[PDB]
Design a protein around this ligand. Structure first.
Ligand SMILES: [Zn+2]
Lengths: 97, 38, 58, 77, 142, 137
RNA sequence: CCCCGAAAGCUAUUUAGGUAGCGCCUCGGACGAAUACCAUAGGGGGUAGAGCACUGUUUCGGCACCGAUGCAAACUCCGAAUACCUAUGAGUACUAUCCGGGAGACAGACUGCGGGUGCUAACGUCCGUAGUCAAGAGGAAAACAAUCCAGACCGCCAGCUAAGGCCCCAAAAUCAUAGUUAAGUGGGAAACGAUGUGGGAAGGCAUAGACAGCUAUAGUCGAGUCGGCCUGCGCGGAAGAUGUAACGGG
């Protein structure tokens, strides 16, 4: 309800160090969703949306809806990786709620 | 006039301008706050 | 058995010894020279090792 | 002044001499080691200086075995 | 010998007059140098002079861009110690525009006897009138 | 002047400073922290000067946490000496700083005073700095 | 006149600019794929990185211990890519090994990568590894052994290209499209300062009238404007002696 992050599909050709660096140059953040009853799903998110969500404190406790096409996944933010110096978000781990 | 690489505003009566490529600080009330260059 | 054309595009004078030997094993002998070789993993390895100075026509 | 260092010992050329999958003959040395980094299995003997040698003709094989988890070298005929 | 060189005796030099009002000095000087050297003729020979006579009028109206009018410096050294003399574009154009054009063109012309001979075919005058009516120059827009 | 109480070896190799600081980049002992953004070397006297400036300007109204300690000795030949004849003697101690390394944290003081004090401290350091705060994730 | 073609290393020496054995060159005989490149299969590791389980070291707390946090060539619970060894195989290369006749050489240099020493100085010095010079011309970098491109059997007033370039000196576009700069920046130089100008995201306020000023919180004024963050290109900081001399010149 509060947060609906719009995600895309991140495939094998888009996985890897080179693909990740290209995506971050295009201002996109790779992310993974892992939870019970299904295998992990790799997705891509928008840096501006992720940064806006991260500011709010309730983002960490409330459930979030990740929309990829018609599919909607209800998850909670599990982990975040930040650049040591610049502090920009780089990767996110979500756990199904 | 003080000539220095770091010229900054001192009080509320100061103003920073650029004359012919030179940065200057001019103060209305105080004639000693005049700064040049930097 | 399919075949592939391979043309040498740059010089080999100051390259690594294994790269020169890969050229020799493929049969290239000078700039602009083109050869026809069998399409096998053994030849593909040599081609990939010297990709930067060859052109492959499939 | 001067320096009190500047000494070193001659090399001893230690290490493995025959690798796994290779063929050996009886008497061939397989491992030169200061201690028992590797232990002997079937058809492998140990010398006074902890050297491991082959007592039979065959193929060398390395493995990890035992509660201790120590490494063994053996020869398969 | 199937390729032939131009014969100096057979060369013909044509006269043209150019007006410098409002034009840019360097972009005019390049074309003047081309025509003086004769790069525009199919009979061009490096060791022969096949160019044309170029008169320049209103030379003191030549223009430069930016702040070059004030900041472009012309130097010259008398061989005496400490004898370096300096001037700038505005004063030099006011006093001797002929020198301005001479410097601009000699810089772009070859250095040697042939270059010295080639630069003689340029006549520069500050006014709108020239004394070469007898040669019947034609108007050239460059 | 921070210096290790004891050491196994008196003299160490020069080495090379590369990589980023994935450890020590998180505020963990206070509220507001100053963090380096490039790499370099920080000396004990520089550490002491920065700490003294910060403490003086905050007027001992909060707690300062120091997260840099100099443990790498540095040697220099005395003077007027030719090359050779062994390594030199120790003259001072330093700490390697990688980008992202946190240098000082402050707890118990207000953001304005802490930031202004960090601004004073930055004028003494030999590398660029930035200001960070505690965060959830 | 024709063919091939090195080395400046290891070991020892009253030895250090000498010499001897080995390594590198050449010729003859014997012997021939037993060789090399690549693919697949099998095999050991303790380096890069990382970590605190041993050794040592560091800070903050609660009772020599416990919680948190950081470091290491001579620390390791861990651990690559490469490199090295063995077997099988396609293709392409007279390869690999042995016996003998003749040598030269044992003062190297620069550059890139991993390091010790030095000041993370030296066209400095000492190792490993690859390229060039040495013993190699041609084109480019103005001039410039060691950089880039490229390996000169002889002749041609024929053509296509590499590095690098197309306004003139001087061969080739004053070519085409969309932007940035105003400093001749381009075409030397930092911490730091402040305004220039382009792009991006966010936030405060507003004709129930903000913002700069002027008049007694008001309003005779009529719509934008106040303050910040991330980025492209520019500005100051910038002093030396022979003569412009820090785009080769115009
Ligand atoms: Zn003032």
């Amino acid at each position: 309800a509060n947060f609906v992050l719009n995600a895309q599909a991140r495939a094998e050709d888009k996985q890897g160090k080179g693909a990740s660096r290209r995506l971050r140059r295009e201002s996109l953040v790779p992310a993974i969703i892992y939870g019970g009853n299904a295998e992990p799903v790799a997705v891509t998110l928008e840096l501006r949306e992720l940064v806006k969500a991260l500011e709010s404190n309730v983002f960490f406790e409330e459930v979030v809806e990740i929309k990829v096409g018609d599919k909607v996944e209800n998850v909670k933010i599990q982990a975040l990786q930040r650049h040591p110096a610049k502090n920009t978000p780089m990767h996110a781990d979500f756990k199904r709620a | 006039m003080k000539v220095q690489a770091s010229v900054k505003k001192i009080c509320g009566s100061c103003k920073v301008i650029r004359r012919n490529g030179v940065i200057r600080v001019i103060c209305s009330a105080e004639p000693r706050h005049k700064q040049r260059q930097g | 058995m399919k075949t592939i054309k391979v043309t040498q595009t740059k010089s080999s004078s100051h390259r690594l010894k294994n790269h020169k030997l890969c050229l020799q094993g493929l049969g290239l002998r000078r700039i602009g020279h083109t050869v026809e070789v069998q399409d096998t993993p053994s030849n593909r390895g040599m081609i990939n090792k010297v990709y930067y100075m060859v052109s492959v026509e499939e | 002044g001067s320096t009190k260092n500047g000494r070193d010992s001659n090399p001893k050329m230690l290490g493995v001499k025959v690798y796994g999958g290779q063929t050996v003959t009886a008497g061939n040395i397989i491992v030169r080691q200061r201690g028992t980094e590797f232990h002997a299995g079937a058809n492998v003997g140990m010398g006074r200086d902890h050297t491991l040698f082959a007592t039979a003709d065959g193929v060398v094989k390395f493995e990890v075995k035992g509660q201790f988890g120590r490494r063994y070298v053996k020869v398969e005929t | 010998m199937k390729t032939l060189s131009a014969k100096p005796a057979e060369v013909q030099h044509d006269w043209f007059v150019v007006d410098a009002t409002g034009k840019t000095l360097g972009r005019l000087a390049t074309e003047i140098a081309r025509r003086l050297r004769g790069k525009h003729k199919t009979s061009y020979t490096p060791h022969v002079d096949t160019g044309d006579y170029i008169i320049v009028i209103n030379a003191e109206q030549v223009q430069v861009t930016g702040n070059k009018a004030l900041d472009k410096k012309y130097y010259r050294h008398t061989e005496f110690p400490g004898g370096l003399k300096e001037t700038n574009f505005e004063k030099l154009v006011a006093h001797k525009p002929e020198e301005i054009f001479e410097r601009a063109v000699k810089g772009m012309l070859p250095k040697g006897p042939l270059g010295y001979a080639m630069i003689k075919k340029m006549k520069v005058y500050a006014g709108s009138e020239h004394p070469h009516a007898a040669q019947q120059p034609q108007v050239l827009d460059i | 002047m921070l210096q290790p109480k004891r050491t196994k070896f008196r003299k160490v190799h020069k080495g090379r400073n590369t990589g980023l600081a994935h450890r020590g980049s998180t505020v963990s002992f206070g509220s507001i922290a100053i963090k380096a953004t490039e790499r370099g070397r920080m000396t004990a006297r520089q550490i002491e000067a920065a700490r003294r400036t910060i403490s003086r300007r905050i007027k001992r109204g909060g707690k300062i946490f120091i997260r840099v300690f100099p443990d790498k000795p540095i040697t220099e030949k005395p003077l007027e000496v030719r090359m050779g004849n062994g390594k030199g003697n120790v003259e001072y101690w330093v700490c390697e700083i990688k980008p992202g390394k946190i240098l000082y944290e402050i707890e118990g003081v207000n953001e304005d005073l802490a930031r202004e004090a960090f601004a004073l401290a930055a004028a003494k350091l030999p590398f660029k700095t930035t200001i960070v705060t505690r965060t959830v994730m």
